[model samples]
Target: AALFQEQAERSEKLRTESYQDNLTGLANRRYFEMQLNARVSNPEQASSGYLLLLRVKDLAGLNQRLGGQRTDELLKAVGEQLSRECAKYPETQNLVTRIRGGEFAVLAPGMTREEALQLAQSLDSALSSLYATGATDVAAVASIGLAPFAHGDSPQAVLSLGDQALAQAEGQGEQNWACLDGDDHHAWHRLLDQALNQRRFELFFQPVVAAQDTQLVLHYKVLSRLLDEQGQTIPAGRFLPWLERFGWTARLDRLMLERVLEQMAGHEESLALNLSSATLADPQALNKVFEILRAHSNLGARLTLEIGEEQLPEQAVLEQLTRRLRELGFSLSLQRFGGRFSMIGNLARLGLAYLKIDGSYIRAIDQESDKRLFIEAIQRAAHSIDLPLIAERVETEGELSVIREMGLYGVQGQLFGEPKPWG
Candidate 1:
């Protein structure tokens, strides 16, 4: 009996050693990848499983203080914490594994999404306190990337979702978690190509009015849209970024400018076309814009081009392009202006015409005092440079009072009306 028990113990130990990461003592990526592939293949089975990617910042820096052996101890403690969490949901084949140096994956089953989220949150909170007690000796921020199984989704696609979320988290610099879901990004690309290739792209105009009614609707910026086969309308925000990514912005720019010129030929109203970094960087596209202006000389009196202020700091290619476009007879305005105050001086140096305050500041006006002050400061700085200011996304009357107080000259957004075809 004793001999048989010893043999069984040896086999069990070998099985664990084979599946677990030697250094981290957590489950290895190979096993996790295999399970992920299986779940993705059979969506019915994937209904309750989730894939979580977790990273702890400053883990490498901790090595200097704890040394290899002590650092190993710290990681082992984390691995044990993960094991304890996984052990709680025995009804499902849940497992937590270490996939790479400093990243871990958890396959959660039996727990609903909210429950899984709570589990991750608990683990994150526990790690915060536990690390200090262990020998790591440094404060670290944990960032989590999560992807729940979806029907007909490819394993690679699902994995990329989590990775993309992780990149967004890293962009915020540390300690934040982001989850990727919804068809926002995917749907954007599909709708963008369809609108461009099929000529389905449409524009909705919003009047940029002077605070006084005497100014009339001197100009309206052309916001792009799409009318699907069913003739249902959707906003350009649904797909503009995808157009830029697919190298179709140049074509879209030409299309919108052509339509604007056509409209202005009749009414002679000033027009604004929202251009992004892609447009600024594309010399060929910028030339086409100039050509359009030249073709419709009367259109210039009725035209302005708006680019986001956040992109203005690129003094090399972007500045050169912006300067050339301005020299070519089109007025230049900065969209989402105060979002990047760090680069305010760059605007004066660049000679932009107007700074459009971002909507986020106005939305927070009721609660945030500093935000209101910040908007006012942005307007003052723009005026100093002989630049006008456009307060955007004025959704509430109280917010409008704040804008009026700031002495904003031009205003546009939902409060005025939804973007509709220019009459």
Candidate 2:
């Protein structure tokens, strides 16, 4: 009997490890996706239900404040409460899953729209209760987006609807929940995907002028714009995050890079392209980039790649890639610099040519003493290591005064120039 019990326990443990989240002991994204596919693919299993996505707005801030271990404890606490609340509805086959960082998803297999909303409210209320995170006691708040689907609805469409609704909920903050109705949408996502398929994306150039002499355009930073069905321009900030979430950034980055090089074919103006560090790590995508650069020969010397802070890779990978890109004669810089406090340690070792102070700091530096002090520190550090610092989003004379006072190498934003299409 003891031997038989041991064998059964081992089997159960393996199954749990495969399908459960290590941090929260809840169902993982893979399990949720599998369960969603099973239900949507089978006519018998498919029925009225809702897919709800919840996101914690300031998780990165929370992590920074509470430390990684404490933040993780909060997340585990969240998952337990969600699971317990979800269990109350025993009549439904419900599953709660952690989709990604600070994001969680709940699958309600047999609940109506009203029932789902009620359950969401209850869950939110339960989560809002006080939870201690070592440093202090705080209430956890989350925004939820719920999409109701029927038996014949496609799983991908349902998931997209939930995500769209979650974006809307995030916009209309106050720890609110939004439900996707049948005919309400900007349809911007569909339009964006269509543009990608049709190769309708275009680039605009915004000049980065020297702060000492605003008349000289030191270089042009390449900006991406997507055209809708009617040819209206859509801003990068509006749709790029969705593309990133949907795994379309690599394709879009390749297209943008190709255009940048092609446009640089006969021009002498040096240009910079913002690339996600994720693209640098993708071997196939990196090959496409290298192949283009190798074909262009001397043109690579005139191009600069700007990588964001959030996507910075592991130390070894970053060191290796930095050396390789430098060998190819392409310049590299860090965008949204100083966003993460820990990034300071990697600055000296990365061999970057420039650091762009994050726009958030530049927006109100004249009024915020803390902002001025931080920018001064970043500038001093950059200069100490021989890396030039650039201030972005310099939209006002007051802001310009602050940038000039700080002695930044260059400044870019509406005050100096706006992005325009290539002639």
Candidate 3:
């Protein structure tokens, strides 16, 4: 009897060690896979839950800079934060796990969307806090992806949703989290399909006031939103990618143009609408857009077309396009600009109405002299061509103070009216 009890205790200890992470002392991938499968395999258990993933945003860079030992210390800090956060939530198993290196998983069962969102936000905020790794405090920023599983869903399906949600979060290139559409995510395709077919879209406008005189209203940026099954709205960030992925950007752009033109026909103030490269890339798509502008030339100057720098066409093709728009008395502008200094000459040559400085350079301008210097240099360059620049996402008064000092052409962000429906 004594020998049997001793063997039993040894066996239990071995299993625990095998399933756990040695460094973080949290459940490792092995235990995660097993538990995930076991829980999802049961009918009732699989009916409700959210599977979330948190990946350290720049662990590879950290590993190179901090070295493995210090980086592991960072991981330990993250592991502890996750467990603590999980402990604070009701019905959370506290079974936070390390999926090999910088990634961790948490299974929150019996929680609604509101609760899971809060839990996910708490985890992201907690992990992003500065941790003392000896001489300096290092932040382990996380990009979290969340997915909800419901009735008769495969573990693999839920896993896919989690991966999909996370892929987009990391796409934003920052410390943020995204959840897949929770009223059964797969069914969302149909919802989007129906919404698009029914033309269930609306534009929210945000004012961009001229910096020289804040009372001077330049124009409002026309932003897009979509209504879902319950008539609740989804913002551009969540649904724009879906349209882009489906090669529907051109179609959507045309729709937006038509809608805005009609609004402009009646409205007194100017409105700017962004057009994706997809519409610019294809000749046929280009033809449609050019036709739309030409037909609406009655209100051309009142409607500005905004192109983001990320999806720019070749200079010659884009040049011709710009000339055509200007010929029709339509004004155009460029956004997400200034960071790529080499493109300055090309962008300046395009006869842009104005340049919108990228937020990356604007976010910490007051705190960092280099950012201020870059924008100042940009200002001097733009001044040479008689071009003006608008500061995008001017969130803080500190940034605004610098924007004022530089005499930027315009200011836009939540600091102004947050983008809401114009009507």
Candidate 4:
């Protein structure tokens, strides 16, 4: 009996050494990837699992501050915390892995997106405490990026989507989670191409108005909508990412601009349209925009071009682009602004017409004091530079009051009215 027990112990030890991370005692990246590939390879089982990528920022800085030993301890603590939170869902096969320094991946078999989101939230909360690592007590925080593997996805697609979501989560900040479900994206990609070729896309408009004068319509943002064969509406959120992923953003934006220009030909209300960052990189696409604006000379003054904070092009490109747009009598504004106040100084240089505060900051203005201060600071910065400020997604009376209090020049969202169908 003793000999048999010893042999079993040796086999178990070998298995653990082969599959587990030395510092955290969790599965290593290799093992996690293997399991992930296996889960998605079988068509019958592909829809049963989700992948979560968790990232900790400033790990190198933390290591320098706290020493390597303490950093390793913190990593171990994080791993244990993940295991504990994942323990709540015993029905699923949960595998946690330390993918690399400051990054980890979790595979939850037999899980749905909603369930994985909950798990991610719980883990985020669990990792938020101040941890004592002998060297010092430091706050532990992490961001989670989630992606689902379904019946039609390949292992590579799952990993890529998870990484994309992870980058998005990191951009949003600590303890946040972002998910991109790619289960149906493959079909959507093919359909998107066909829709583009067949001109099956449609535009919807959302109104942006002056904060002080709610009765005045400032302009409507042109939103993209995809249609199915049956003429049913498919949400932009579901399809636009695929457009970007497949390198079709430039073509789609150009097409939408063409349609929007035609729709606005005789309209009194001004309109705003989004130009993807990718579109800015393509010189050919930019020239097409120039041609269209030139053809619609009278309509230029009433059109606004909006680009997101993260989507700003090269400084020289933006400067020249904004100058040309202004020369053409078109207004230019920053969309999803206020993510970084450091970039505020660029407004004066770019000569942008307006600054639209990001919705994430606006959504919690009434609830979060820090967010309020941030926006107030941004407002101050904007005003100092003679830049007009607009708040996006003002969905409540309280939010509107906050926006007014902050002296934002304009506002947009459901509080004023829902976006009407583009004529």
Best by TM-score: 4
Residue 361's lDDT in candidate 2: 59
Each model's TM-score? 0.58, 0.61, 0.58, 0.62
The worst-scoring run of ten residues by lDDT in candidate 2 lies at: 37-46
Deviation in Å, model 1, residue 26 alpha carbon? 32
Model 4 stretches with alpha carbons more than 4 Å out: 1-182, 339-341
Report the lDDT of model 4 for residue 160. 93
Candidate 3 residue-wise lDDT, 158-178, digit = tens: 778889988988777555888
Q: List pairs with backbone clashes in candidate 1.
A: 270-302, 271-302
RMSD of 2: 16.4
Q: What C-alpha lDDT do the candidate models reach, one value each?
A: 0.63, 0.72, 0.73, 0.73
> What TM-score would you give candidate 4 relative to the actual structure?
0.62
lDDT of 2 by residue, 128-163 (tens): 762443332445467778898666678798899999
Judging by TM-score, tell me the better candidate of 1 and 2: 2
**Residue-level lDDT tens digits of model 4 in 1-423:** 343234334434543555569888887776576566544532212245678888776788878988898788788888888888876653233367888998988876556566787887888777776343332344546678888766457778888988999888877744478877544657867898999998888888888899988888888878877789899876564566467557798988988999999999767888899987778888888888988888888998888989877677766677788898877888788887643433332445777778887665577578766557667766655676677888877878898888888888999987886655865
Error (Å) of candidate 3 at residue 26 is: 35
